[PDB]
């Protein structure tokens, strides 16, 4: 009531931040940005909770105000800045680059990438419109407006943009057989090949996806993010390759790893 809220209770925060309940009452309310509040990762969470480079939010503030953190090639001093899917985090002082990719359990993994792969990112386009004297435009999941896109790029396709120039380098059409990632829901974090799309006019479309090991799942069309042409990815996948293991195989692998390593 009476205008926007500026706080976020720690228990009302997104569960994929893996925050604990005894640390405090509040969670870092992510600032407005290119990614939604519930499907982002605030810079403080990444720098403190994941990378353990800082112990408190003050140390995260010191790191960020030393202009050491670059998100998508731009220095970001906001510690609650919302970093999201496919966003590139480059820390030049320590010489490592990360790409925010969901792990198979629906959480943002600490996925280290080579500096060559840190120069671009994949963006799913959200709408294409024509404005201002017949100039086509393109809106991505990253809230980037790219003017003069290729006429073959339509909605639900993912483009590849160079971060330095912010211009489209390549694109993948949304079609069966193309590799994709699920960015929302129960199957969030899973990687597979698109097999079939069911269209429901006036409602949400359903896309069916099959893993490398043949597991088949489905999700709404808005949750589909095509990664590469065919079954090969255009980006580097996390330690797990998008395969979701059942709890039985997870336990079996954990027990085998415990046995082998002492």
């Amino acid at each position: 009531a009476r205008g926007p809220k500026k706080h976020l209770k720690r228990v009302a925060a997104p569960k994929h931040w893996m925050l604990d309940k005894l640390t405090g009452v509040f969670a870092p309310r992510p600032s407005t940005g290119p990614h939604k509040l519930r499907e982002c990762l605030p810079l403080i969470i990444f720098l403190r909770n994941r990378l353990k480079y800082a112990l408190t939010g003050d140390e995260v503030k010191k790191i960020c105000m030393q202009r050491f953190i670059k998100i998508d090639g731009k220095v970001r001093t906001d510690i609650t800045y919302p970093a999201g899917f496919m966003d590139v985090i480059s820390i030049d002082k320590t010489g490592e680059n990360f790409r925010l990719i969901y792990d198979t359990k629906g959480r943002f993994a600490v996925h280290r990438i080579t500096p060559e792969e840190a120069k671009y990112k994949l963006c799913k386009v959200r709408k294409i419109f024509v404005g201002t004297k017949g100039i086509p435009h393109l809106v991505t999941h990253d809230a980037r407006t790219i003017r003069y896109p290729d006429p073959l790029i339509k909605v639900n396709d993912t483009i590849q943009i160079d971060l330095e120039t912010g211009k489209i380098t390549d694109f993948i059409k949304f079609d069966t057989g193309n590799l994709c990632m699920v960015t929302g829901g129960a199957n969030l974090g899973r990687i597979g090949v698109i097999t079939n799309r069911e269209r429901h006019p006036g409602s949400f479309d359903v896309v069916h996806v099959k893993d490398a090991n043949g597991n088949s799942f489905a999700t709404r069309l808005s949750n589909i993010f095509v990664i590469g042409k065919g079954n090969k990815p255009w980006i580097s996948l996390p330690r797990g390759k998008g395969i979701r293991l059942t709890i039985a195989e997870e336990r079996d692998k954990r027990l085998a790893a415990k046995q082998s390593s002492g």
Binding site: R147, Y148, D150, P151, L152
Partner: peptide, 30 residues
Amino acid sequence: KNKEEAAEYAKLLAKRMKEAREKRQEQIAK
């Protein structure tokens, strides 16, 4: 920048429309 982007898009549009015309001609050939 506006002028260069307009020129580059004009060239790309010419290529795209020419290939669309060629595809339509090939389709009507059959």
